[PDB]
Symmetry: C6
Subunit: 208 residues, 6 copies
């Protein structure tokens, strides 16, 4: 990644083994649970396109997902080339979609773009494409419809609400009415009596 | 976070994998036991609003709590906008509530506010809102009333006092009389004989 | 904590996750065995009062002890206010007891005091109060009187001496005669024959 | 490796124990699964030829593979000598193939070449030869032909596609038609009905 | 410890949690096996007397040994005072034995002595006293005489030689003849035939 | 070790606990498997003679090997004294063999030699002697002759070749004919038919 060293200027540093291991392990443990995406974004802070490709390529499993991600990246790269069409000796060339994705650009070129004044943030642009692709995978691999999250007869309301919003997160909605409808008979009666405008805190307190 | 490097000036550094992992693991192990809040505050030292959102978004479970936290944040952001209402080329704009919460502001804007002279400490303001929300969750998820913490017949006084003050911490009180009333017959008699003004040390010594 | 960076001046750095975790884990594993206190002192090297409070507040268990510690701190803070009684624009105010304990002072104020010329070492003063409180807790939670540490018939002298001085450490004495008196018949006879002025090394060699 | 320190210039730093351990452990855990190669490339970022040899030589197992790698390196070194044939006091000599591979060059010579203006990137050249050799080993140790990856009667389509693209990665192809042909009767019928130009996302959605 | 920072001058840094933990763990795992002493010396590189006391005081077990160590330190401190007998405003005082041991000196005084020109190396002097004491403990806790290390009938010569020199290390000798005498009948006959001046390598080869 | 800090000049840094632990653990896990030597070389990068002795002395087991290593070092030190025979106030003395091995030289003297212009690389010279000694130990502790590595009837050729080259590495040869001769009847027939000049890759492919 590009890091502001202990002095000032922005400079390339190798990806740390701790970062590499952290990413490999979170994918192994969590697969494509929604929270893996913010972890990816955090672990790839300041990443060049080369670094982003390193992180994606170190994943051993989930090759269906990684092929789907490649398709999303290729679509975004094509849309870049449509909107931003393009060798002077010693001068910086303009990046194409495949340069942003790191397949046809060098690390030196990537650093050159990212540290230019003004900066051409190829790492951040590529990361956006990757996260777009990862979100699609999270949605596809979401096991259950929100319609099928219903509170059990002996299920604590808190545990039901956890399942409900876990599912909504994976299905990726932009809500409280379905939460009441899918509650068990006893909780539903309590929640109906609260009326409109009740906060989640108030609902959870009422059913505790 | 914003860190004073080995030279002087305040500068942004990415969140370390050790910090990211530490936070995810403490939430996994301790849930919303009261001590998770000081840990959150410590792990988010110098955090920008983006960093705070990263930490909250990397939590996979407890999505009922995370939805309640969003509601608290939205309330605090609205109260900010009421008290602090608000584009000159190249100039710093004033942050709204949604900018403090990192949803409508960029990292560059956040760094700009936090390192201004005088500083507009958007990271610290947002952290206050988050901790307010987390405290509410700790209180809600507290399993037992202090009224129901009573010393067992064969329970060491020390173990009872530990349960008592653990519960008070979770229920969040701003005390010694209820500790005596909820003690077992043998300890209660000893503690009654000590009289008023006895310290906890003296009570624990007397019942040892 | 306040650290001398790789250049010179004293500057604040956040508490590291490794430090935070180390402290939480030692309290979990060792409780209030005497050796936890030097570990606390070492882990809190250069700590501000805010940092010291962070470390104490991250402890989840032992809330009887943490309440006793608060009482000791309040007593020391009151004695500070008696001996050191106390707003000029832009000037440093004098710290009260509650400022030394971090409850009524800001981090910026604490850094200001600690890096003043001459320095007002509020972190070190508070750490002294904390260690005074922790020593009281170690003594209270010491399970056994030194009078009840006696050598078993088949117990190696070395193992007995380990138990003896472990107990003395916890009970906190400022000695060799009781060690002989509490030894088993066979070792006692050997140790009596050595006479006065025998070193612990000589005693342990004689009973090996 | 050669690292840009916190100031500027490129300078040699020893390989960290974390890097050494990371590489040894990934080879132990993953053998020559395809994802080990990007991990190798990432862990050897900025490596001198000496550093690359260190990493390869710390591998205890897989000595058939390491002998095959030596053969590939010797072939690439010979092709270098054919294309780039070659002592002035105090001057930099031109590297031969065996100098690029670190067998006949010193660390000081390697640093001299890598930090020259313009740079003679012996570390990157050698790393290319190594990765060429490792790719050959990955292909050889690939257990299964893509022809033998067929969807089970009760196998989820997602799990089949994972096996399919895992195998293609190991066999190293530069595709969708064989994926349909090797699917089970029920999925094959669904996929045939989608027609030409269907994306992997669309295929996986259709068979979910 | 006192460390030469990334710039130059010698400066105090706190003991790292990794160092603290490393020392506690090696004492827990190895007790007073001889190799713990070089580990102690390595972990306490650049230590002030305060740091050395921290390391010793963090040990929870082995309080017989720690009391014996105190006695050795007191003897060495007394011998210092005999050989080096001893307040000008703002000037450096001469250290006594108790100052070298850190019991009557401050950290600031210790840093002052250690970074003086010429340096008064109180950390190194104290470390010598400690290692002298630790060596005595290693010798005392050595379980077996070298006279009782004899090769078993079916014991590989290599395993016997390992036991032999492990024991000699613990007993602390400043040799080959006893190794032959304590070997089993078959190995003894082979070793006798080699004659005088045989190296350990030659002996081990002959009995392999 | 001597490290080029983040600024420039070469300066001493203490051995890290991570390095110390890494070395102790690799010796515990791998004993004198051949790959331990490159690990030793990597972990001791920039080591002074004192640092090298620290690493060797922290090994608890294998004291037969450590005694053999001492003998090799003494032989190399004697050969140094024969080839390089040898106090001006404030001037650098010439190192003897025992100074290179760190037994009669101080750390300050070692740093002085290693950072001289031109440098007298006592750390690298000593490391060469140590590695010479370690290689002898690896060869001695190699359990099996290459003559006794023969392919089993049902043993995959790859697994046989791994055993074969693992053994050759330990026995330390400077080859393909014995690999064919020691193969099983079925593989031998296939390999004979390939003829002369076949690569290991081609042999392994033919027997797969």
């Amino acid at each position: 990644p590009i890091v502001q060293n202990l002095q000032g200027q922005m400079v390339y540093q190798c990806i740390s083994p701790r970062t590499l291991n952290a990413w490999v392990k979170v994918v192994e443990e969590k697969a494509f649970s929604p929270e893996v995406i913010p972890m990816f974004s955090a672990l790839s802070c300041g990443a060049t396109p080369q670094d982003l490709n390193t992180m994606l390529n170190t994943v051993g499993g989930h090759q269906a997902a990684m092929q789907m991600l490649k398709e999303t990246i290729n679509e975004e790269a094509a849309e870049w080339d449509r909107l931003h069409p393009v060798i002077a000796p010693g001068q910086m060339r303009e990046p194409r979609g495949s340069d942003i994705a790191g397949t046809t650009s060098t690390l030196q070129e990537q650093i050159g773009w990212m540290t230019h004044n003004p900066p051409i943030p190829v790492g951040e642009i590529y990361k956006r494409w990757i996260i777009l692709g990862l979100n699609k995978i999270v949605r596809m691999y979401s096991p259950t419809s929100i319609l099928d999250i219903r509170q059990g007869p002996k299920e604590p309301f808190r545990d039901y609400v956890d399942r409900f919003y876990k599912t909504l997160r994976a299905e990726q909605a932009s809500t409280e009415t379905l939460l009441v409808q899918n509650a068990n008979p006893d909780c539903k009666t309590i929640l109906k009596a609260l009326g409109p405008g009740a906060t989640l805190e108030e609902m959870m307190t009422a059913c505790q």
